[PDB]
Amino acid sequence: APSYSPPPPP
Amino acid sequence: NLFVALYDFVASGDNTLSITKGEKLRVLGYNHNGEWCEAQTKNGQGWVPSNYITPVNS
């Protein structure tokens, strides 16, 4: 899984 | 079971998968902190934000 954060909802 | 994408998310490498609002998908698992989820659609598999999906039909 990506280590960075998922983008917040638009 | 079946989930549906609440918003559009464009794949950015690192094993991610693009998903379109309204698209249906199967959730196969989650990462350590639950923020990312392993999805499977008609386009393949990849990680998508967990808060971008909800169960199909609320």
From Swiss-Prot, chain B:
Widely expressed. It is found in: Cytoplasm, Cytoskeleton; Nucleus; Mitochondrion. Residues 1-58 form the SH3 domain. It comes from the Eukaryota. Transmembrane segments: none annotated. The modification Phosphotyrosine is found at Y7, Y52. Disulfide bonds: none annotated. Phosphorylation at Tyr-7 by members of the SRC family of kinases disrupts SH3 domain-based autoinhibitory interactions and intermolecular associations, such as that with ABI1, and also enhances kinase activity. Belongs to the protein kinase superfamily. Tyr protein kinase family. ABL subfamily. Non-receptor tyrosine-protein kinase that plays a role in many key processes linked to cell growth and survival such as cytoskeleton remodeling in response to extracellular stimuli, cell motility and adhesion, receptor endocytosis, autophagy, DNA damage response and apoptosis. Coordinates actin remodeling through tyrosine phosphorylation of proteins controlling cytoskeleton dynamics like WASF3 (involved in branch formation); ANXA1 (involved in membrane anchoring); DBN1, DBNL, CTTN, RAPH1 and ENAH (involved in signaling); or MAPT and PXN (microtubule-binding proteins). Interacts with SORBS1 following insulin stimulation. Found in a trimolecular complex containing CDK5 and CABLES1. Interacts with CABLES1 and PSTPIP1. Interacts with ZDHHC16, ITGB1 and HCK. Interacts with STX17; probably phosphorylates STX17. Interacts with INPPL1/SHIP2. Interacts with ABI1, ABI2, BCR, CRK, FGR, FYN, HCK, LYN, PSMA7 RAD9A, RAD51, RAD52, TP73 and WASF3. It is linked to Leukemia, chronic myeloid: A clonal myeloproliferative disorder of a pluripotent stem cell with a specific cytogenetic abnormality, the Philadelphia chromosome (Ph), involving myeloid, erythroid, megakaryocytic, B-lymphoid, and sometimes T-lymphoid cells, but not marrow fibroblasts. A chromosomal aberration involving ABL1 has been found in patients with chronic myeloid leukemia. Translocation t(9;22)(q34;q11) with BCR. The translocation produces a BCR-ABL found also in acute myeloid leukemia (AML) and acute lymphoblastic leukemia (ALL). This is Tyrosine-protein kinase ABL1. It comes from Homo sapiens (Human). The chain holds residues 64 to 121 of 1130 of the full protein.
